[PDB]
């Protein structure tokens, strides 16, 4: 009865025409109630692939895979300001959203942070949160509402019932060679965020060497799609081109992230270019959440939350909220596990650091016991690099690559040998890029 | 003596235990050589600060270590040894099918296992309303069992992890029992020590779940895989569906009855199916029995459908002393209740959730279970018939039957089952009863 349905779908799809809002939401609940085969999804993937989709159907594919699970409401809270979050494709050393989210918390944004775990090299954040004792990533969402409404802000994993429809529908992609779609890859990487109930979103698009797309242009091409999709979708949404040619902050990890990611709310390090991107997003949630008029409005308050402490404040009554010391800013090298073996890593010439493999580079962090080759796996949460050279810097005995932290020396020694072989020198030194490249809006 | 506080404050630093620590504490724990005081602070160090994967598998080999542990390989088997482990729920009858079914395909199934706790079901108690059934063959009769017929249900002796006692006893009055190294090690020790080749586990999602969330059931199962696996037996572990009774019937004569109809084929709860052939299929992979799924599938729906599963749990009945012709003639052996009549829902929607823990509970209350050790219990009463998450229900289509004592806790089980599951216009979103397979 669906099958038959289902196969009318797949065919007028298969013939060019534009599917309707009913017949994409018939079809995404039949892939969430698993009444549609997986030959039927394969093939409607399939057309896809090759006809593609119209904005319609993009958003209605979209929200379709948003609406198959839950939905966040916020109204019954009545909360005085947006809720707004920040979505990223990823990289190493991106701790930007344990800044991001209290600094926008600060500013009087709501940022229910829903997010997740490792993936193939780069850090998932709760992975990193997890580092700090006590810290629950799973409270039950009576605590989450609490806390956004008195904190602002929280960095959860509760994802099981969000858009529970891309689930069967990527396991399909990935076996029929239907995964390298636009319309598709939008729906994935969309869904699960608009689920939040968001008002306003940014999107981070990596460039580089170290990004998702491949190509300066194929960044751009997805954020636009993104873009399009989001707004269309009723969230008012922009996305920022960020560079990834390197590590963004200067450790790689997790206890190390974190300790990164305290100092920078406090003033005691910040890494320029973390720096230059984690405001450039901040700035977009305040226009588009309309807490802003303009980039230098933003900026002012974003920097004022910076200097008197209110953004490192949001992030311990976050941290406290979710059941970690409630004294961690102030003391948070009591909390974080320490590595049994910090050491410096030199090159083994003298030059200018050119180029870096970043994926490389996270891959080491995860061979160290940093990250999970298995889900099955336990994460050494105080394994990692730190003061992580950059591109452009002078290299000799002097001035080393990275400190790397580890649980003893045979893995010392091997993530040394991954690091050397991950970072390229030369006599003459590179030319400087932007981190923050082309803002998009819709 | 004073290692004890050594290592309690080296955890409290966030510092890791080696395994000479963790056998030490373990050992003091079982000798009764480390206080209470000193037990509950280290749970409390690792409540907060968890503990790495050689930590975890060090616990929880120190706790198998700390008793018996069975070993096979002198009675050379031409199989491997295998078996399930759940977390629990109503209605969760699978071990009495799953291992005549893994012993039928060529598995030695060894399963020592348990009675009801809180609000779920114990395979023990149920086999116990089979009239001779002995659940403690000495370990002569239980080797021969295995070897001669392939499977054995039985319960555990005192060194079966002895350590986890203590320990347990401990936590659930500290506030240390939620922690996933703790619950790891307390799951796995026991199992372990029945020297297996391969196990798998069943995690339960949902109302009637272990855990409260599907995330947390995901994290368990993943730890405990990791554990198992690095404790050096092949282990796989299945998210299934317990937002609502798993087979048709809860309670104990009512299970086992409903056990011997789905062997025979004369009835097959289709849910229940689903997650006992899944269950199976893992416990013939891991143990080198079956290439893959659907081979093992083939074995498994053909001892379902030639009688030969059915036959080997009669022969396992009979070998642990109860009737030679237990499964042609279960109704002459099984208690009747003495009150057995269907409850009927006030509206007249579709069935939208059910609180399987209250359902258990119901079960409990009528005499079903226990709430302390010494209770007896009824073997008799439960229900039948269940009605299922998503069914239509109106007047003439009941929510269950409900077998009692008498009216008066008839009338306390209809109470308990009406308010327990909740009827609405809209039908709900399906559920799956096989959520994921983990492996490593
Ligand atoms: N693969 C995994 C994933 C999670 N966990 C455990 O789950 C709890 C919360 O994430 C934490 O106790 C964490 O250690 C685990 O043990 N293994």
Redesign the interface.
Known sequence: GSMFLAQEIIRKKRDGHALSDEEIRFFINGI????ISEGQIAALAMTIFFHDMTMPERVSLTMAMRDSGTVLDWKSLNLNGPIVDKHSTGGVGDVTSLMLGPMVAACGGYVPMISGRGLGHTGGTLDKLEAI??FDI?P?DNRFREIIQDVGVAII?????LAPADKRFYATRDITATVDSIPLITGSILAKKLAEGLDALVMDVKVGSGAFMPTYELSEALAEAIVGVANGAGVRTTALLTDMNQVLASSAGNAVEVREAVQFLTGEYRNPRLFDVTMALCVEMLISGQLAKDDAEARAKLQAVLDNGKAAEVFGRMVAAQKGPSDFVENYDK?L?TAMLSKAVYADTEGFISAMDTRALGMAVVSMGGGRR?????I?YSVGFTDMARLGDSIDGQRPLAVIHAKDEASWQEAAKAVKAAIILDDKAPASTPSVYRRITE
């Open positions: 969430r109630d698993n009444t004792p006590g799973f039950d994993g509760q994802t099981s019932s909390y596990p298995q889900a099955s796996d336990t050494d």
